[PDB]
Structure formats: C-alpha cells, structure tokens
Amino acid sequence: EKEQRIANQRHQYQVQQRQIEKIETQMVQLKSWSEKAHRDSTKQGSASERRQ
RNA sequence: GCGAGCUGGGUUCAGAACGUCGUGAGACAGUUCGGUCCCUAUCCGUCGCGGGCGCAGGAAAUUUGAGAGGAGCUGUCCUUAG
Ligand SMILES: [K+]
Ligand SMILES: [Mg+2]
Ligand SMILES: [Mg+2]
Ligand SMILES: [Mg+2]
Ligand SMILES: [Mg+2]
C-alpha cells in the first residue's frame, strides 16, 4: 500500500508541475509579444502613415 | 498647402472567416471579404457687374500714364564644315 501511495503522490505532483510549466510558457510567449508590440508601435507603415 | 472644393481605395465601428494565442469571453505577435463623407455663405478674402457722390459751372468726345497685371519655355534639321 505504501508503494501505491507514493506512486499516486508522485503522479499527482507531476501533473501539477506540468500545469505550472504550461502557464509559464504561455506567460513567456505573451511577454515577448508585448515587448515586440510596444517596440513596433512606432515603426509601421510608410513615413506619412507613421505620422498619422 | 488644398475634404463648409471632390474622391474614400488604405487604415481603426458594428458582420464573417483563416493562421496563431487563450480554459474562456475574446485577442494580435498576422491576414481576408463586406461596410451611411452632413451644411441654403452673415463677415473678411477672391472673380465679375452695377448704383451714389466726389474731382469749385453744366455737358459730349479723345487721351497722358503714377501705378497694376500678362507674357517670359525649348527640341530637331540644314549651313558654316566633315
Ligand atoms: K486553442
Ligand atoms: Mg501589430
Ligand atoms: Mg478647407
Ligand atoms: Mg475605404
Ligand atoms: Mg470677419
């Protein structure tokens, strides 16, 4: 029975860690996008259209 | 420079879709098809046209020009001369 409890406990911990890593990957991706968005906010379109 | 002068193709309303992201409503680090352009000009300004008076009498013509505007471009060939 102790073996099974350890196995169940180990499995459940891994599931949680996968969730955490998933969300951190999301955050990293969204950050990168946000920085690029702000960086490109001023550099799009032709000269005249930038001045709009 | 110029939308009370015109257009409205791009983009940034509401629809819909692709890629991608999000558990999601939705979103762009990307695209795509469709999407109401209102106003009778008072004043100055600008382009034309009149009326009034003035210009030491009242008229009909012809004029000077202070001043203002307009115009202001350029090719090729022949000759000089192979
Ligand atoms: K998804
Ligand atoms: Mg963008
Ligand atoms: Mg105007
Ligand atoms: Mg349009
Ligand atoms: Mg005024």
Side-chain angles (χ1 to χ4, degrees), chain A residues 22 26 29-30 33 36-37 44 52:
Chain A
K22 192 187 72 174
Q26 293 180 356
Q29 189 183 5
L30 284 177
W33 284 351
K36 173 169 167 154
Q44 305 181 9
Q52 275 180 117

PDB file of all heavy atoms in Angstrom, chain A residues 22 26 29-30 33 36-37 44 52, chain B residues 10-11 20-23 28-30:
ATOM      1  N   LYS A  22       3.231  24.799 -18.152  1.00  0.00           N
ATOM      2  CA  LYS A  22       2.388  25.245 -19.255  1.00  0.00           C
ATOM      3  C   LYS A  22       2.093  26.734 -19.141  1.00  0.00           C
ATOM      4  O   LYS A  22       2.248  27.488 -20.106  1.00  0.00           O
ATOM      5  CB  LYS A  22       1.081  24.456 -19.274  1.00  0.00           C
ATOM      6  CG  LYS A  22       0.287  24.649 -20.552  1.00  0.00           C
ATOM      7  CD  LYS A  22      -1.081  24.004 -20.497  1.00  0.00           C
ATOM      8  CE  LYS A  22      -2.004  24.775 -19.564  1.00  0.00           C
ATOM      9  NZ  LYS A  22      -3.402  24.264 -19.578  1.00  0.00           N
ATOM     10  N   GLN A  26       3.219  29.987 -21.516  1.00  0.00           N
ATOM     11  CA  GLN A  26       2.266  30.980 -22.002  1.00  0.00           C
ATOM     12  C   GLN A  26       2.727  32.389 -21.663  1.00  0.00           C
ATOM     13  O   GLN A  26       2.762  33.272 -22.524  1.00  0.00           O
ATOM     14  CB  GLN A  26       0.897  30.713 -21.384  1.00  0.00           C
ATOM     15  CG  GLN A  26       0.255  29.433 -21.845  1.00  0.00           C
ATOM     16  CD  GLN A  26      -1.095  29.215 -21.215  1.00  0.00           C
ATOM     17  OE1 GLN A  26      -1.523  29.990 -20.364  1.00  0.00           O
ATOM     18  NE2 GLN A  26      -1.769  28.148 -21.613  1.00  0.00           N
ATOM     19  N   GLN A  29       5.697  33.592 -23.661  1.00  0.00           N
ATOM     20  CA  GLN A  29       5.300  33.901 -25.029  1.00  0.00           C
ATOM     21  C   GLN A  29       4.558  35.230 -25.104  1.00  0.00           C
ATOM     22  O   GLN A  29       4.822  36.053 -25.986  1.00  0.00           O
ATOM     23  CB  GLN A  29       4.440  32.764 -25.568  1.00  0.00           C
ATOM     24  CG  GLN A  29       4.119  32.842 -27.040  1.00  0.00           C
ATOM     25  CD  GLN A  29       3.212  31.711 -27.468  1.00  0.00           C
ATOM     26  OE1 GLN A  29       2.760  30.924 -26.642  1.00  0.00           O
ATOM     27  NE2 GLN A  29       2.971  31.601 -28.765  1.00  0.00           N
ATOM     28  N   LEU A  30       3.606  35.447 -24.195  1.00  0.00           N
ATOM     29  CA  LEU A  30       2.829  36.683 -24.201  1.00  0.00           C
ATOM     30  C   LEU A  30       3.697  37.898 -23.905  1.00  0.00           C
ATOM     31  O   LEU A  30       3.504  38.961 -24.503  1.00  0.00           O
ATOM     32  CB  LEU A  30       1.697  36.593 -23.181  1.00  0.00           C
ATOM     33  CG  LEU A  30       0.479  35.750 -23.539  1.00  0.00           C
ATOM     34  CD1 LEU A  30      -0.491  35.727 -22.377  1.00  0.00           C
ATOM     35  CD2 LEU A  30      -0.195  36.295 -24.773  1.00  0.00           C
ATOM     36  N   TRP A  33       5.694  38.896 -26.974  1.00  0.00           N
ATOM     37  CA  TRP A  33       4.782  39.582 -27.882  1.00  0.00           C
ATOM     38  C   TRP A  33       4.546  41.016 -27.435  1.00  0.00           C
ATOM     39  O   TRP A  33       4.596  41.949 -28.242  1.00  0.00           O
ATOM     40  CB  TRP A  33       3.456  38.833 -27.934  1.00  0.00           C
ATOM     41  CG  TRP A  33       3.481  37.582 -28.734  1.00  0.00           C
ATOM     42  CD1 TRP A  33       4.482  37.139 -29.540  1.00  0.00           C
ATOM     43  CD2 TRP A  33       2.464  36.582 -28.769  1.00  0.00           C
ATOM     44  NE1 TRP A  33       4.143  35.934 -30.093  1.00  0.00           N
ATOM     45  CE2 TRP A  33       2.908  35.568 -29.631  1.00  0.00           C
ATOM     46  CE3 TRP A  33       1.217  36.449 -28.158  1.00  0.00           C
ATOM     47  CZ2 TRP A  33       2.150  34.439 -29.900  1.00  0.00           C
ATOM     48  CZ3 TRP A  33       0.470  35.330 -28.425  1.00  0.00           C
ATOM     49  CH2 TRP A  33       0.936  34.339 -29.288  1.00  0.00           C
ATOM     50  N   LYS A  36       7.547  43.164 -28.185  1.00  0.00           N
ATOM     51  CA  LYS A  36       7.605  43.430 -29.618  1.00  0.00           C
ATOM     52  C   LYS A  36       6.524  44.417 -30.031  1.00  0.00           C
ATOM     53  O   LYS A  36       6.766  45.308 -30.852  1.00  0.00           O
ATOM     54  CB  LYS A  36       7.478  42.132 -30.410  1.00  0.00           C
ATOM     55  CG  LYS A  36       7.353  42.367 -31.899  1.00  0.00           C
ATOM     56  CD  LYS A  36       7.494  41.103 -32.703  1.00  0.00           C
ATOM     57  CE  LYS A  36       7.057  41.341 -34.131  1.00  0.00           C
ATOM     58  NZ  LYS A  36       7.714  40.418 -35.084  1.00  0.00           N
ATOM     59  N   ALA A  37       5.317  44.260 -29.486  1.00  0.00           N
ATOM     60  CA  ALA A  37       4.222  45.164 -29.816  1.00  0.00           C
ATOM     61  C   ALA A  37       4.584  46.607 -29.490  1.00  0.00           C
ATOM     62  O   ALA A  37       4.398  47.506 -30.314  1.00  0.00           O
ATOM     63  CB  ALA A  37       2.962  44.744 -29.065  1.00  0.00           C
ATOM     64  N   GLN A  44       5.757  51.271 -38.112  1.00  0.00           N
ATOM     65  CA  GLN A  44       4.926  50.518 -39.038  1.00  0.00           C
ATOM     66  C   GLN A  44       4.455  51.451 -40.141  1.00  0.00           C
ATOM     67  O   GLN A  44       4.271  52.649 -39.920  1.00  0.00           O
ATOM     68  CB  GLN A  44       3.717  49.871 -38.362  1.00  0.00           C
ATOM     69  CG  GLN A  44       4.062  48.992 -37.187  1.00  0.00           C
ATOM     70  CD  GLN A  44       2.841  48.367 -36.566  1.00  0.00           C
ATOM     71  OE1 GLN A  44       1.746  48.456 -37.110  1.00  0.00           O
ATOM     72  NE2 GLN A  44       3.019  47.735 -35.418  1.00  0.00           N
ATOM     73  N   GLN A  52       0.473  59.700 -38.868  1.00  0.00           N
ATOM     74  CA  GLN A  52      -0.948  59.818 -38.570  1.00  0.00           C
ATOM     75  C   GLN A  52      -1.168  60.026 -37.078  1.00  0.00           C
ATOM     76  O   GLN A  52      -0.415  59.525 -36.242  1.00  0.00           O
ATOM     77  CB  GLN A  52      -1.679  58.572 -39.056  1.00  0.00           C
ATOM     78  CG  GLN A  52      -2.056  58.648 -40.518  1.00  0.00           C
ATOM     79  CD  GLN A  52      -2.777  57.416 -40.998  1.00  0.00           C
ATOM     80  OE1 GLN A  52      -3.936  57.478 -41.403  1.00  0.00           O
ATOM     81  NE2 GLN A  52      -2.095  56.282 -40.952  1.00  0.00           N
TER      82      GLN A  52
ATOM     83  P     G B  10      -9.953  49.666 -48.677  1.00  0.00           P
ATOM     84  OP1   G B  10     -10.027  48.238 -48.309  1.00  0.00           O
ATOM     85  OP2   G B  10     -10.919  50.618 -48.090  1.00  0.00           O
ATOM     86  O5'   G B  10      -8.494  50.179 -48.335  1.00  0.00           O
ATOM     87  C5'   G B  10      -7.341  49.588 -48.911  1.00  0.00           C
ATOM     88  C4'   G B  10      -6.119  49.981 -48.134  1.00  0.00           C
ATOM     89  O4'   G B  10      -5.843  51.385 -48.366  1.00  0.00           O
ATOM     90  C3'   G B  10      -6.288  49.859 -46.633  1.00  0.00           C
ATOM     91  O3'   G B  10      -5.960  48.563 -46.177  1.00  0.00           O
ATOM     92  C2'   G B  10      -5.391  50.957 -46.083  1.00  0.00           C
ATOM     93  O2'   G B  10      -4.039  50.535 -46.014  1.00  0.00           O
ATOM     94  C1'   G B  10      -5.511  52.024 -47.160  1.00  0.00           C
ATOM     95  N9    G B  10      -6.555  53.027 -46.882  1.00  0.00           N
ATOM     96  C8    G B  10      -7.775  53.093 -47.500  1.00  0.00           C
ATOM     97  N7    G B  10      -8.495  54.101 -47.115  1.00  0.00           N
ATOM     98  C5    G B  10      -7.687  54.764 -46.213  1.00  0.00           C
ATOM     99  C6    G B  10      -7.935  55.934 -45.466  1.00  0.00           C
ATOM    100  O6    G B  10      -8.947  56.639 -45.456  1.00  0.00           O
ATOM    101  N1    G B  10      -6.855  56.264 -44.668  1.00  0.00           N
ATOM    102  C2    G B  10      -5.686  55.560 -44.596  1.00  0.00           C
ATOM    103  N2    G B  10      -4.757  56.041 -43.764  1.00  0.00           N
ATOM    104  N3    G B  10      -5.439  54.466 -45.287  1.00  0.00           N
ATOM    105  C4    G B  10      -6.475  54.134 -46.080  1.00  0.00           C
ATOM    106  P     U B  11      -6.263  48.136 -44.668  1.00  0.00           P
ATOM    107  OP1   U B  11      -5.808  46.744 -44.469  1.00  0.00           O
ATOM    108  OP2   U B  11      -7.666  48.490 -44.370  1.00  0.00           O
ATOM    109  O5'   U B  11      -5.313  49.082 -43.819  1.00  0.00           O
ATOM    110  C5'   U B  11      -5.316  49.002 -42.411  1.00  0.00           C
ATOM    111  C4'   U B  11      -5.308  50.358 -41.763  1.00  0.00           C
ATOM    112  O4'   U B  11      -5.621  51.389 -42.733  1.00  0.00           O
ATOM    113  C3'   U B  11      -6.356  50.540 -40.682  1.00  0.00           C
ATOM    114  O3'   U B  11      -5.942  49.968 -39.455  1.00  0.00           O
ATOM    115  C2'   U B  11      -6.528  52.050 -40.638  1.00  0.00           C
ATOM    116  O2'   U B  11      -5.484  52.668 -39.902  1.00  0.00           O
ATOM    117  C1'   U B  11      -6.371  52.414 -42.114  1.00  0.00           C
ATOM    118  N1    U B  11      -7.656  52.573 -42.833  1.00  0.00           N
ATOM    119  C2    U B  11      -8.330  53.765 -42.701  1.00  0.00           C
ATOM    120  O2    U B  11      -7.945  54.661 -41.976  1.00  0.00           O
ATOM    121  N3    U B  11      -9.496  53.855 -43.414  1.00  0.00           N
ATOM    122  C4    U B  11     -10.024  52.903 -44.256  1.00  0.00           C
ATOM    123  O4    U B  11     -11.082  53.128 -44.838  1.00  0.00           O
ATOM    124  C5    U B  11      -9.255  51.707 -44.368  1.00  0.00           C
ATOM    125  C6    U B  11      -8.121  51.597 -43.677  1.00  0.00           C
ATOM    126  P     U B  20      -2.647  27.266 -36.500  1.00  0.00           P
ATOM    127  OP1   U B  20      -1.700  26.132 -36.477  1.00  0.00           O
ATOM    128  OP2   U B  20      -4.080  27.019 -36.246  1.00  0.00           O
ATOM    129  O5'   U B  20      -2.130  28.341 -35.456  1.00  0.00           O
ATOM    130  C5'   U B  20      -0.814  28.853 -35.549  1.00  0.00           C
ATOM    131  C4'   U B  20      -0.616  30.030 -34.635  1.00  0.00           C
ATOM    132  O4'   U B  20      -1.392  31.152 -35.129  1.00  0.00           O
ATOM    133  C3'   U B  20      -1.104  29.858 -33.210  1.00  0.00           C
ATOM    134  O3'   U B  20      -0.191  29.156 -32.389  1.00  0.00           O
ATOM    135  C2'   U B  20      -1.312  31.299 -32.776  1.00  0.00           C
ATOM    136  O2'   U B  20      -0.069  31.930 -32.504  1.00  0.00           O
ATOM    137  C1'   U B  20      -1.889  31.906 -34.047  1.00  0.00           C
ATOM    138  N1    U B  20      -3.365  31.828 -34.057  1.00  0.00           N
ATOM    139  C2    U B  20      -4.064  32.771 -33.341  1.00  0.00           C
ATOM    140  O2    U B  20      -3.529  33.670 -32.727  1.00  0.00           O
ATOM    141  N3    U B  20      -5.419  32.644 -33.384  1.00  0.00           N
ATOM    142  C4    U B  20      -6.132  31.680 -34.040  1.00  0.00           C
ATOM    143  O4    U B  20      -7.359  31.702 -33.978  1.00  0.00           O
ATOM    144  C5    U B  20      -5.343  30.729 -34.752  1.00  0.00           C
ATOM    145  C6    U B  20      -4.017  30.833 -34.730  1.00  0.00           C
ATOM    146  P     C B  21      -0.717  28.352 -31.105  1.00  0.00           P
ATOM    147  OP1   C B  21       0.423  27.609 -30.529  1.00  0.00           O
ATOM    148  OP2   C B  21      -1.956  27.636 -31.472  1.00  0.00           O
ATOM    149  O5'   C B  21      -1.114  29.496 -30.082  1.00  0.00           O
ATOM    150  C5'   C B  21      -0.143  30.395 -29.579  1.00  0.00           C
ATOM    151  C4'   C B  21      -0.768  31.399 -28.651  1.00  0.00           C
ATOM    152  O4'   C B  21      -1.579  32.325 -29.418  1.00  0.00           O
ATOM    153  C3'   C B  21      -1.743  30.848 -27.635  1.00  0.00           C
ATOM    154  O3'   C B  21      -1.110  30.230 -26.533  1.00  0.00           O
ATOM    155  C2'   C B  21      -2.543  32.091 -27.275  1.00  0.00           C
ATOM    156  O2'   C B  21      -1.797  32.958 -26.436  1.00  0.00           O
ATOM    157  C1'   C B  21      -2.681  32.750 -28.642  1.00  0.00           C
ATOM    158  N1    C B  21      -3.932  32.325 -29.304  1.00  0.00           N
ATOM    159  C2    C B  21      -5.102  33.012 -29.012  1.00  0.00           C
ATOM    160  O2    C B  21      -5.049  33.988 -28.261  1.00  0.00           O
ATOM    161  N3    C B  21      -6.256  32.631 -29.585  1.00  0.00           N
ATOM    162  C4    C B  21      -6.277  31.583 -30.392  1.00  0.00           C
ATOM    163  N4    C B  21      -7.445  31.245 -30.924  1.00  0.00           N
ATOM    164  C5    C B  21      -5.110  30.838 -30.684  1.00  0.00           C
ATOM    165  C6    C B  21      -3.969  31.237 -30.119  1.00  0.00           C
ATOM    166  P     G B  22      -1.819  29.003 -25.782  1.00  0.00           P
ATOM    167  OP1   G B  22      -0.878  28.507 -24.756  1.00  0.00           O
ATOM    168  OP2   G B  22      -2.356  28.076 -26.802  1.00  0.00           O
ATOM    169  O5'   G B  22      -3.067  29.659 -25.053  1.00  0.00           O
ATOM    170  C5'   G B  22      -2.884  30.713 -24.126  1.00  0.00           C
ATOM    171  C4'   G B  22      -4.195  31.269 -23.644  1.00  0.00           C
ATOM    172  O4'   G B  22      -4.822  32.033 -24.705  1.00  0.00           O
ATOM    173  C3'   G B  22      -5.259  30.259 -23.262  1.00  0.00           C
ATOM    174  O3'   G B  22      -5.046  29.701 -21.980  1.00  0.00           O
ATOM    175  C2'   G B  22      -6.522  31.099 -23.344  1.00  0.00           C
ATOM    176  O2'   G B  22      -6.655  31.935 -22.206  1.00  0.00           O
ATOM    177  C1'   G B  22      -6.224  31.967 -24.567  1.00  0.00           C
ATOM    178  N9    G B  22      -6.816  31.378 -25.778  1.00  0.00           N
ATOM    179  C8    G B  22      -6.248  30.538 -26.691  1.00  0.00           C
ATOM    180  N7    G B  22      -7.080  30.165 -27.615  1.00  0.00           N
ATOM    181  C5    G B  22      -8.270  30.788 -27.282  1.00  0.00           C
ATOM    182  C6    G B  22      -9.537  30.766 -27.905  1.00  0.00           C
ATOM    183  O6    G B  22      -9.882  30.170 -28.926  1.00  0.00           O
ATOM    184  N1    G B  22     -10.463  31.535 -27.220  1.00  0.00           N
ATOM    185  C2    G B  22     -10.208  32.238 -26.082  1.00  0.00           C
ATOM    186  N2    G B  22     -11.222  32.927 -25.562  1.00  0.00           N
ATOM    187  N3    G B  22      -9.038  32.269 -25.493  1.00  0.00           N
ATOM    188  C4    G B  22      -8.125  31.525 -26.143  1.00  0.00           C
ATOM    189  P     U B  23      -5.183  28.121 -21.728  1.00  0.00           P
ATOM    190  OP1   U B  23      -4.987  27.897 -20.280  1.00  0.00           O
ATOM    191  OP2   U B  23      -4.342  27.386 -22.694  1.00  0.00           O
ATOM    192  O5'   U B  23      -6.698  27.799 -22.069  1.00  0.00           O
ATOM    193  C5'   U B  23      -7.116  26.478 -22.363  1.00  0.00           C
ATOM    194  C4'   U B  23      -8.570  26.282 -22.028  1.00  0.00           C
ATOM    195  O4'   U B  23      -8.735  26.401 -20.595  1.00  0.00           O
ATOM    196  C3'   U B  23      -9.518  27.323 -22.596  1.00  0.00           C
ATOM    197  O3'   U B  23      -9.924  27.023 -23.917  1.00  0.00           O
ATOM    198  C2'   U B  23     -10.674  27.306 -21.609  1.00  0.00           C
ATOM    199  O2'   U B  23     -11.561  26.232 -21.877  1.00  0.00           O
ATOM    200  C1'   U B  23      -9.960  27.028 -20.296  1.00  0.00           C
ATOM    201  N1    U B  23      -9.701  28.251 -19.503  1.00  0.00           N
ATOM    202  C2    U B  23     -10.729  28.689 -18.704  1.00  0.00           C
ATOM    203  O2    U B  23     -11.803  28.123 -18.656  1.00  0.00           O
ATOM    204  N3    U B  23     -10.462  29.806 -17.967  1.00  0.00           N
ATOM    205  C4    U B  23      -9.287  30.511 -17.945  1.00  0.00           C
ATOM    206  O4    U B  23      -9.205  31.500 -17.226  1.00  0.00           O
ATOM    207  C5    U B  23      -8.259  29.997 -18.793  1.00  0.00           C
ATOM    208  C6    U B  23      -8.498  28.906 -19.522  1.00  0.00           C
ATOM    209  P     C B  28      -6.332  43.236 -30.818  1.00  0.00           P
ATOM    210  OP1   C B  28      -6.383  44.679 -30.512  1.00  0.00           O
ATOM    211  OP2   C B  28      -7.284  42.681 -31.804  1.00  0.00           O
ATOM    212  O5'   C B  28      -4.855  42.873 -31.291  1.00  0.00           O
ATOM    213  C5'   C B  28      -3.799  42.711 -30.352  1.00  0.00           C
ATOM    214  C4'   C B  28      -2.724  41.774 -30.849  1.00  0.00           C
ATOM    215  O4'   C B  28      -3.316  40.481 -31.147  1.00  0.00           O
ATOM    216  C3'   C B  28      -2.006  42.218 -32.120  1.00  0.00           C
ATOM    217  O3'   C B  28      -0.618  41.896 -32.049  1.00  0.00           O
ATOM    218  C2'   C B  28      -2.688  41.397 -33.207  1.00  0.00           C
ATOM    219  O2'   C B  28      -1.891  41.173 -34.350  1.00  0.00           O
ATOM    220  C1'   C B  28      -2.998  40.099 -32.469  1.00  0.00           C
ATOM    221  N1    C B  28      -4.155  39.369 -33.011  1.00  0.00           N
ATOM    222  C2    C B  28      -3.990  38.183 -33.726  1.00  0.00           C
ATOM    223  O2    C B  28      -2.858  37.721 -33.899  1.00  0.00           O
ATOM    224  N3    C B  28      -5.074  37.547 -34.208  1.00  0.00           N
ATOM    225  C4    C B  28      -6.285  38.049 -34.018  1.00  0.00           C
ATOM    226  N4    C B  28      -7.321  37.383 -34.521  1.00  0.00           N
ATOM    227  C5    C B  28      -6.485  39.256 -33.306  1.00  0.00           C
ATOM    228  C6    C B  28      -5.405  39.873 -32.831  1.00  0.00           C
ATOM    229  P     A B  29       0.439  43.070 -31.782  1.00  0.00           P
ATOM    230  OP1   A B  29      -0.045  43.870 -30.640  1.00  0.00           O
ATOM    231  OP2   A B  29       0.666  43.745 -33.079  1.00  0.00           O
ATOM    232  O5'   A B  29       1.771  42.332 -31.317  1.00  0.00           O
ATOM    233  C5'   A B  29       2.979  42.462 -32.053  1.00  0.00           C
ATOM    234  C4'   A B  29       3.482  41.133 -32.548  1.00  0.00           C
ATOM    235  O4'   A B  29       3.143  40.103 -31.594  1.00  0.00           O
ATOM    236  C3'   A B  29       2.869  40.645 -33.847  1.00  0.00           C
ATOM    237  O3'   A B  29       3.480  41.220 -34.984  1.00  0.00           O
ATOM    238  C2'   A B  29       3.066  39.137 -33.764  1.00  0.00           C
ATOM    239  O2'   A B  29       4.371  38.766 -34.177  1.00  0.00           O
ATOM    240  C1'   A B  29       2.930  38.882 -32.262  1.00  0.00           C
ATOM    241  N9    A B  29       1.603  38.365 -31.887  1.00  0.00           N
ATOM    242  C8    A B  29       0.660  38.984 -31.117  1.00  0.00           C
ATOM    243  N7    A B  29      -0.419  38.275 -30.934  1.00  0.00           N
ATOM    244  C5    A B  29      -0.167  37.104 -31.627  1.00  0.00           C
ATOM    245  C6    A B  29      -0.926  35.941 -31.819  1.00  0.00           C
ATOM    246  N6    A B  29      -2.144  35.760 -31.314  1.00  0.00           N
ATOM    247  N1    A B  29      -0.382  34.956 -32.556  1.00  0.00           N
ATOM    248  C2    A B  29       0.838  35.137 -33.063  1.00  0.00           C
ATOM    249  N3    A B  29       1.649  36.181 -32.950  1.00  0.00           N
ATOM    250  C4    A B  29       1.078  37.144 -32.214  1.00  0.00           C
ATOM    251  P     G B  30       2.636  42.151 -35.977  1.00  0.00           P
ATOM    252  OP1   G B  30       3.456  42.359 -37.192  1.00  0.00           O
ATOM    253  OP2   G B  30       2.132  43.328 -35.235  1.00  0.00           O
ATOM    254  O5'   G B  30       1.384  41.258 -36.369  1.00  0.00           O
ATOM    255  C5'   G B  30       0.748  41.424 -37.622  1.00  0.00           C
ATOM    256  C4'   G B  30       0.797  40.157 -38.431  1.00  0.00           C
ATOM    257  O4'   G B  30       0.186  39.084 -37.664  1.00  0.00           O
ATOM    258  C3'   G B  30       0.007  40.183 -39.726  1.00  0.00           C
ATOM    259  O3'   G B  30       0.727  40.734 -40.809  1.00  0.00           O
ATOM    260  C2'   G B  30      -0.351  38.720 -39.937  1.00  0.00           C
ATOM    261  O2'   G B  30       0.737  37.991 -40.484  1.00  0.00           O
ATOM    262  C1'   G B  30      -0.586  38.261 -38.508  1.00  0.00           C
ATOM    263  N9    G B  30      -2.005  38.359 -38.125  1.00  0.00           N
ATOM    264  C8    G B  30      -2.602  39.226 -37.249  1.00  0.00           C
ATOM    265  N7    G B  30      -3.882  39.032 -37.131  1.00  0.00           N
ATOM    266  C5    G B  30      -4.144  37.967 -37.975  1.00  0.00           C
ATOM    267  C6    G B  30      -5.351  37.301 -38.275  1.00  0.00           C
ATOM    268  O6    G B  30      -6.482  37.519 -37.842  1.00  0.00           O
ATOM    269  N1    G B  30      -5.157  36.280 -39.189  1.00  0.00           N
ATOM    270  C2    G B  30      -3.959  35.936 -39.746  1.00  0.00           C
ATOM    271  N2    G B  30      -3.975  34.916 -40.607  1.00  0.00           N
ATOM    272  N3    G B  30      -2.826  36.544 -39.477  1.00  0.00           N
ATOM    273  C4    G B  30      -2.994  37.538 -38.588  1.00  0.00           C
TER     274        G B  30
END
